[PDB]
Amino acid sequence: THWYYFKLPGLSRQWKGPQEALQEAAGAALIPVSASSAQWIPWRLLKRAACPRPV
């Protein structure tokens, strides 16, 4: 899994996350943005965070 800071494609003065991507595709990652929704965020609105370590 890759983890990302994200901005929403249609808003955004603050970075959100980092969040674990649920899936990756060409030019976008599927990011949880609420308790009931995920959004395909284009790369230009993502920053790759370091992966956290299992406990």
Residue numbers in the entry: 10 to 20, 22 to 65
List sentences quoted exactly from the publication behind this structure.
IN first catalyses 3′-processing of the vDNA ends, exposing reactive 3′ OH nucleophile groups that it uses to attack a pair of phosphodiester bonds within target DNA (tDNA), resulting in strand transfer. In this work, we determine the three-dimensional structure of the deltaretroviral intasome and characterize its interactions with its host factor, the PP2A-B56γ subunit. The deltaretroviral IN host cofactor B56γ14, as part of the heterotrimeric protein phosphatase 2A (PP2A) holoenzyme, interacts with a number of chromatin-associated proteins and potently stimulates concerted integration activity of deltaretroviral INs14.
To aid the interpretation of the cryo-EM map, we generated a high-quality homology model of the STLV-1 IN/NTD using the SWISS-MODEL server, and determined a series of X-ray crystal structures spanning the catalytic core domain (CCD) and the C-terminal domain (CTD) of HTLV-2 and -1 IN. The IN/CTD structure was determined in isolation as well as in complex with B56γ. While the canonical IN/CCD dimer observed in crystals could be docked directly into the cryo-EM map, the CTDs could only be docked as monomers. We speculate that the dimers and trimers observed in IN/CTD crystals may be relevant within viral particles prior to vDNA synthesis by reverse transcription.
